[PDB]
Design a binder for this molecule. Sequence first.
Ligand SMILES: [Cl-]
Length: 537
Amino acid sequence: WSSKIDFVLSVAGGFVGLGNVWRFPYLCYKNGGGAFLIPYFIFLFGSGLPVFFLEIIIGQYTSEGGITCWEKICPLFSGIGYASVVIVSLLNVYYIVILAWATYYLFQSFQKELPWAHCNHSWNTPHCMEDTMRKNTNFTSPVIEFWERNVLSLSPGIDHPGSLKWDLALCLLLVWLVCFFCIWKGVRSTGKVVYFTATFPFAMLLVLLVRGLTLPGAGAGIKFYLYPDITRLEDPQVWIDAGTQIFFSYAICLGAMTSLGSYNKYKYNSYRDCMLLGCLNSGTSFVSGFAIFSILGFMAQEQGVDIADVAESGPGLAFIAYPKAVTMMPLPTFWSILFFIMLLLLGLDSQFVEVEGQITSLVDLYPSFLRKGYRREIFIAFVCSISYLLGLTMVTEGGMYVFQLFDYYAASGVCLLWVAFFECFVIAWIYGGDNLYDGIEDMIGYRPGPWMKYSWAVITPVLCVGCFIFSLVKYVPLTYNKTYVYPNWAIGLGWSLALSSMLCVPLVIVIRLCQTEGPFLVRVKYLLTPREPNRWA
Ligand SMILES: [Cl-]
């Protein structure tokens, strides 16, 4: 009631999504259970929360979105905004594809028996034994066979596109139509409906966690998830994956948080409200990991296979562990329907915000003719179409590898670290930590501690440079389910996708330097001078 106003901030969002229920457990399973947690917490307490708070501060202080805020903070490094516009452009290409998969599952759960519960279907290989009789050449679980042969129909490689999955294509088209109709009119129920749309995911996750814990053999899965392997920390990929998972969950380095914080009033205590949201999101990820890694332990106990070889290392872990746990609950159809409705709600809640922010940024880029002369709706329908067609490369039979490439490069990997390092360097060494603290004192009412200052100045750039150096020196090529080796051209395409956003900052720097006149020192003096960031106040 009276205190719910604070919870009203939590009603905004940013505490639950597909980056906690889907991406975090799959990344943890790929990079080992316990060894993934230490870099995750290091990036959470050293770079994640500081960068989130910094983006909120920039948005509130400059009262501008992703692009225009850097025009007042440091014009020379304005391309940091543009890179974000690229990243959010790539994410919307593939982040919605997951929904399609879930949508397909939501269409497969409307029958008497779940299709992923028996081997007696037409999409099952001859070597398919039910998990109950698994313990009595190699045998495959019916859930994995349903995921790989019916939902995906996986191809031998990325160079085998095959044909378009008509069911998956129809589901993706339906999801895109829903997004367009929810953006072309901006139909957000809010009211009391937001209560349900915010409490249902936690209600379902609590039941999932209870079911996972009650499953026999979950102790081994929990031990695998918690106890870290020290040697696995030597691989830089664990650190990169943890940092990029933190950034993906916090939606930072995309310009969305700056735009969201621009709505906040100048005299607003956002320091506490950003730490609360970050802690809630991290706790949600940590708790949701326990359910999946207990289901994995139960599956490993019942099948007899190892915990690390019982599911898919790559994407789709949430489509193997959760559907398997659903078949254990009484009346599995109802629980499967609820779980996939929750997944659809979370995905749509994230996608609406991301696509609307991208459209707003692109309209504000040049509204003279994009939204004034020409009808704005024409831009809404077109962009999604461009995002829809580019998604059809992940609808084909061999589209899972393309989705993995996008998930590893388009909105993760070195691009997010690059953007975070540039933001922190611009704020701490160009704008100045004390200069920003002076504004923060007026914005929130008190001077923050040295944690944010030393994270922006030292910790985050050091982490984002060490990650680059160690990932380049110890270069491990990307693999799918630790069995498939991508071709050289696929790796080149992924690196080109990363560079499409990485090169925005240097190109904008070059353009800005070239458009100016005079000796180089005069140009660098003009372009590094803030353009009255707090003119709005
Ligand atoms: Cl997370």
